[PDB]
Amino acid sequence: GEELFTGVVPILVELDGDVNGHKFSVSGEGEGDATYGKLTLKFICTTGKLPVPXPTLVTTLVQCFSRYPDHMKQHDFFKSAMPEGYVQERTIFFKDDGNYKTRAEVKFEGDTLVNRIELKGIDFKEDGNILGHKLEYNYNSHNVYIMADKQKNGIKVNFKIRHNIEDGSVQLADHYQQNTPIGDGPVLLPDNHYLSTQSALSKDPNEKRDHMVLLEFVTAAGI
């Protein structure tokens, strides 16, 4: 998998979500650079307008592009499972509100990294920060903690996302993630470490559709 990321790799993202009955689809395109954990993506709601705070989909919308220092390469599970891919399941918990159930599939298609996602949101309040749309358009920095799951030959990742509300308060998004290999080949079970992340959200001056230009950097550390 490492030899497949020594450069820039095209990325396609397909999302299918149903939050509180509200259906929608997101399509994203971009390129990632694992040499510097750099991600360049543009997303577009193809079903029209998005029903929830578009920023609540970042974590859901390519962790194999993280940059792993030369002394930690033996803990890169995301690339160890390539090109066959790996499955990423996750439950996001929003404080005092609903949650997201996701089942995505990361893999290669010819030479394009593809992330096919399924989303399902339930129990979301009508006037809360999510369906009420009170979240500010800006992301923060968070530490992604990762630990091995030898019994499943996969990984357990758990972190917290903090969303800025426009009244100045914060919104917690507890993330519980789990990953497993899609093939039968060997993957690398890592030591406990964590990925450092920072993202920048912005808009396209010439885009009339719902969208999200995003820049992100991710580096592994903790050892």
11 CB-near residues (< 8 Å, 6+ apart): 28, 29, 30, 31, 32, 39, 41, 62, 112, 113, 114, 115
Contact predicate 108/4, CB 8 Å: yes
214 CB-near residues (< 8 Å, 6+ apart): 30, 39, 40, 41, 42, 43, 58, 199, 200, 201, 202
Distance of CA 172 to CAs 127, 142, 223, Å?
A: 17, 12, 27
CB atoms within 10 A of CB 156: 14
Q: Are strands 86-94 and 170-181 parallel, antiparallel or unpaired?
A: antiparallel
172 CB-near residues (< 8 Å, 6+ apart): 93, 94, 95, 160, 161, 162, 163
Task: Please report, to the nearest 10 degrees, the dihedral formed by the alpha carbons of residues 68, 221, 219, 69 taken in order.
Answer: -30
Residue 167 tokens read as: 């009244």
CA-nearest of 105, 120, 89, 123 to 23 is: 120
DSSP string computed for 160-189: EEEEEBTTS-EEEEEEEEEEEESSSS--PP
Q: In which residue are the tokens 């497993």 written?
A: 180
Residue 165 tokens read as: 């509300």
Give the E-state strand segments of the chain in sequence order: 8-19, 22-33, 38-45, 86-94, 99-109, 112-122, 141-149, 154-164, 170-181, 193-202, 211-221
Cα–Cα distance measured from residue 166 to residue 164, given in angstroms and rounded to the nearest whole number: 7
Q: Are strands 154-164 and 170-181 parallel, antiparallel or unpaired?
A: antiparallel
Q: In which residue are the tokens 């509180």 written?
A: 20
- List residues in the chain that are followed by a break over 2.5 Å (C to N): 61
- All domains in the chain, ordered by first residue: 1-223 (2.40.155.10)
What is the 8-class DSSP label of residue 79? H
Contact predicate 135/145, CB 8 Å: no
CB atoms within 10 A of CB 56: 21
Cα 9 from chain centroid? Answer: 17
Would you call 205 helix, strand, or coil by DSSP? coil
